[PDB]
Amino acid sequence: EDPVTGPEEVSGQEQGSLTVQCRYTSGWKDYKKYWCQGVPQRSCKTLVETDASEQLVKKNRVSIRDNQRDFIFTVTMEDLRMSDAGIYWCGITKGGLDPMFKVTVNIGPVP
């Protein structure tokens, strides 16, 4: 059983928002959580990261908030555009190899 999991595939639309539920096991409660973009996996670009508390952090068009009661940190990507599509990662920061879970983000136009 994995340390952090979420949706394998999410889809959003132009100017819309999408929400990614990164669930983790209880042991990772007091660790920093983050949302990463791109490949190679281990050199991905961190878009936003918590300070290991429950306070919401927002950078550019991405926000993150850690729920340390239900052990879920929620990533919101807002004002979506086509260039946002690609490979992302739920991340937990620790010494060495991070627990990471791949989330593929599909972006389409509004019908």
Binding site: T5, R42, S43, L97
Partner: protein, 297 residues
């Protein structure tokens, strides 16, 4: 004795930053003019710079004490306590990493010999070099991590390993993460050059995963590095005037300056790359001052 060079053709020599034959010889003003390569660096007096090793078999490789584990969601994970490739202990000092450690960035596929408790086999691991990682790589501290996707444990036995490079994904010719984001001692950037002078590049192509060939350059063939390291010449001036001649006929192709700091410059004012024949040889002419003006190519 007076400095000399072996009459080896570049096409027959060993690349100094990726373990492959030298395939090209060129200048290219559109590339970064002062690269900070850590392998392939030597002074003409024989002093090895950066992480440059004597042997070409050390290039872009490493050795380590390996401790293995399986972690669901990652696969088989390796914690490498780095050693020097001859088995001696690595001591953090005035270089960025153990000798021969990769001096470029990307996701490196490495091969090590493994064994289980459950015969010997060769296992391919993924190791992120840089430019930045979320793995806290610190070869300067003797600490690197690698992993491979697996549904269940490979039941690997801990022990000493030699890691050889198999391929590279997302290659970037920038120095890797040597110390978890902290600064490290580095060989200085290659240079300086006079106005109109550009770096002579010995080129090979590395196996890559992401169809155009992936070029990587070095300042000198590995044979020239061991040549200077073995001869310990006395340095008399700022640079050596070299002539690159055809091996069979002796025809002159270009003249260049081998600076005492271990890099070759040509006088070239073109915009794009200029490739040269690889079946020539370099001959030392004389010592010249730094301001010696080369004939343009």
């Amino acid at each position: 004795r007076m400095v000399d060079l072996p009459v080896l053709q570049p096409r027959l020599c060993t690349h100094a930053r990726w373990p492959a034959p030298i395939y090209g010889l060129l200048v290219d003003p559109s590339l970064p003019s002062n690269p900070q390569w850590q392998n392939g660096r030597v002074h003409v007096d024989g002093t090895l710079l950066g992480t440059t090793p004597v042997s070409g078999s050390w290039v872009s490789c490493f050795a380590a004490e390996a401790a293995y584990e399986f972690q669901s969601g990652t696969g088989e994970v390796a914690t490498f306590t780095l050693i020097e490739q001859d088995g001696s202990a690595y001591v953090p000092g005035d270089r960025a990493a153990p000798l021969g450690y990769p001096d470029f960035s990307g996701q490196l596929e490495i091969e090590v010999q493994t064994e289980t408790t459950k015969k010997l086999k060769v296992t391919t691991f993924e190791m992120i070099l840089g430019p930045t990682t979320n793995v806290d790589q610190a070869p300067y501290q003797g600490r690197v991590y690698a992993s491979l996707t697996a549904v269940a444990s490979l039941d690997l036995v801990d022990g000493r390993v030699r890691a050889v490079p198999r391929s590279i994904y997302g290659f970037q010719d920038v120095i890797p993460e040597y110390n978890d984001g902290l600064l490290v001692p580095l060989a200085p950037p290659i240079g300086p050059f006079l106005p109109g002078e550009v770096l002579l590049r010995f080129r090979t192509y590395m196996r890559q995963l992401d169809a155009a060939a992936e070029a990587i350059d070095c300042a000198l063939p590995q044979e020239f590095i061991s040549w200077f390291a073995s001869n310990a010449f006395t340095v008399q001036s700022d640079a050596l005037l070299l002539r690159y001649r055809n091996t069979l006929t002796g025809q002159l192709l270009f003249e260049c300056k081998l600076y005492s700091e271990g890099y070759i410059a040509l006088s070239y004012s073109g915009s794009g790359p200029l490739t040269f024949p690889t079946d020539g040889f370099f001959e030392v002419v004389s010592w010249v001052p730094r301001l010696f003006q080369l004939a343009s190519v």
